[PDB]
């Protein structure tokens, strides 16, 4: 931005319906401060948000330390507050060649007084005189009757703690809603009837994508199951309804003779295909690798399941 707002009246850009690349800010590294809270700066373009916000303002260098969760201070309490459960990044840089003026830059203002503290992301732009004393001020400036809003002494000769800094705070909002702000990961076409990884607007998982036998109403992009995970989705570019089936898996057990008689064993893969896991036997309980089969009934020795047992014969 060419110009930033005063900290008493910070700008709030509402961001939605965009492709967001945070790696770019990180990689340019033009910032002296680049600290993320509740989120990592390390190229996290994998996660997507319902909405994001970018709050922008100018403060003194020694005040940069207050732009964080869990803080108190003149800005943290009266000009710009973050929630203590905040997820977002604080980015800041020195503006000596932009915001410096001969005689001092007095365009940037901060709140010195209020009768209460601010809520997270609250703004207060009132100039009503603050009454510090016990008598009424009635709009009159004086001792114990303060204009609550004061200018910064941003002089061209000041040291670093007093230099103006341009601060942007990027807040990441995740709701049970489609992520409209999502990073520029390479777009790929969906592969049906195969086990794939998915990322639908930042919502990830693994499964086999199949045609749905149910329809969804037009107001929503996805459905969820008993564990609150994605059951099915509407593709975000073409509105097809596709179910996501968990990829085949199961416990693996070994059927073994005592290792004093023989060492021929088979591995039973519960509820999966023999092609997924020469002596290959497929049954309902699972697949046995290292085994043969007979269609006759006999006494049970080591059970497989569902009425079938393994045994040893020549």
């Amino acid at each position, epitope marked *: 931005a060419t110009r930033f707002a005063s900290v008493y009246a910070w700008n709030r850009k509402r961001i939605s319906n965009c492709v967001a690349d945070y790696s770019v800010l990180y990689n340019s590294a033009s910032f002296s401060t680049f600290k993320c809270y509740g989120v990592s700066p390390t190229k996290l373009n994998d996660l997507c948000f319902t909405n994001v916000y970018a709050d922008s303002f100018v403060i003194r260098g*020694d005040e940069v330390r207050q732009i964080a969760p869990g803080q*108190t201070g*003149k800005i943290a309490d009266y000009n710009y507050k973050l929630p203590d459960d905040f997820t977002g990044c604080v980015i800041a840089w020195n503006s000596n060649n932009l915001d410096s003026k001969v005689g001092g830059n007095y365009n940037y203002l901060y709140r*010195l*007084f209020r009768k209460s503290n601010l809520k997270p992301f609250e703004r207060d732009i009132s100039t009503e005189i603050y009454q*510090a*004393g016990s008598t009424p001020c009635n709009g009159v400036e*004086g*001792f*114990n009757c*303060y204009f609550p809003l*004061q200018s910064y002494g941003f002089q061209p000769t000041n040291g670093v703690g007093y230099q103006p800094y341009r601060v942007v705070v990027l807040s990441f909002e995740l709701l049970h809603a489609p992520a409209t702000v999502c990073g520029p990961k390479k777009s790929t076409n969906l592969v049906k009837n195969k086990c794939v990884n998915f990322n639908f607007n930042g919502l990830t998982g693994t499964g086999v994508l199949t045609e749905s036998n149910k329809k969804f109403l037009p107001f929503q992009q996805f459905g969820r199951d008993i564990a609150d995970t994605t059951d099915a989705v509407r593709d975000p570019q073409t509105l097809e309804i596709l179910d996501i089936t968990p990829c085949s898996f199961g416990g693996v057990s070994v059927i073994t003779p005592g290792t004093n008689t023989s060492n021929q064993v088979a591995v039973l893969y519960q509820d999966v295909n023999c092609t997924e896991v020469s002596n290959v036997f497929q049954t309902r309980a699972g697949c046995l690798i290292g085994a043969e089969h007979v269609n006759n009934s006999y006494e049970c020795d080591i059970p497989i399941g569902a009425g079938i047992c393994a045994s040893y014969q020549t």
Partner: antibody
Framework: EVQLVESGGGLVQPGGSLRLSCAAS????????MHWVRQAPGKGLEWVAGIYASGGATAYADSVKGRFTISADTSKNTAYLQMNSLRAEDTAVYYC?????????????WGQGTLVTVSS | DIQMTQSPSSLSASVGDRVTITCRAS??????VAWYQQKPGKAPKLLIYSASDLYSGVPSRFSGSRSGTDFTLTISSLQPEDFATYYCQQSHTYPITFGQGTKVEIKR
């Protein structure tokens, strides 16, 4: 370079008056308040008076009210304290100082202080 | 008229040690507090003004902060030249009152 130079102290007997001056250099008076602070020998510090250079409005410590008058001159870039009705209880080192707004800000810079003494 | 309490009345510390002196106000004083250093035979020098702003000509060793209503003044490392009386002033509501002042000893 910012400097404050006090002058005009001396010995004045009870019932008399003494005028103190303090010159400013390296900065203006406009936009600032000017103050005087008193330090009696053997004691800590007590404020006497303050003036806003750009408004003319003043405030006085209750203990000096009616006797100690504060003023400032932005053409000369200097400030004054007119101390009348002096008593031996008013003997102190008198300091000049500057600050922002009427109050709510501390003093940035003090002069060295000029000593006045009185006795029986 | 806000009254100040400065504590401890005296502190002892060796050269190179970290020293903290605190001041508490009886009422709200915003960020109007000033920190002074006084040597025998000399006028108090200003170290800090308006709670956290360093005065020119003052070593970087002098710093401070506020938590709740407690104002803390710190010397990051005492030098032989820092064994002086310290004071707090609250320039908020007039008459302006100062604390008692405190001393620092060398531990000889």
């Amino acid at each position: 370079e910012v400097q404050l130079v006090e002058s005009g102290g001396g010995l004045v007997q009870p019932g008399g008056s003494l005028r103190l001056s303090c010159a400013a250099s390296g900065f203006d008076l406009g936009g600032y308040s000017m103050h005087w602070v008193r330090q009696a020998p053997g004691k800590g510090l007590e404020w006497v008076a303050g003036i806003y250079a750009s408004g003319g409005a003043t405030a006085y410590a209750d203990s000096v009210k009616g006797r100690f008058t504060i003023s400032a001159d932005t053409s000369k870039n200097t400030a004054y304290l007119q101390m009348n009705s002096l008593r031996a209880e008013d003997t102190a080192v008198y300091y000049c100082a500057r600050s922002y707004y009427y109050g709510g800000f501390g003093m940035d810079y003090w002069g060295q202080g000029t000593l006045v003494t009185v006795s029986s | 008229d806000i009254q100040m309490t400065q504590s401890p009345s005296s502190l002892s510390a060796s050269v190179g040690d970290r020293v903290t002196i605190t001041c508490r106000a009886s009422q709200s004083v915003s960020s109007a507090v000033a920190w002074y250093q006084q040597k025998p035979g000399k006028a108090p020098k200003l170290l800090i003004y308006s709670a956290s702003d360093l005065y020119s000509g003052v070593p970087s060793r002098f710093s401070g902060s506020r938590s709740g209503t407690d104002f803390t003044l710190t010397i990051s490392s005492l030098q032989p030249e820092d064994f002086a009386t310290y004071y707090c002033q609250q320039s908020h509501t007039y008459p302006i009152t100062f604390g008692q002042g405190t001393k620092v000893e060398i531990k000889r």
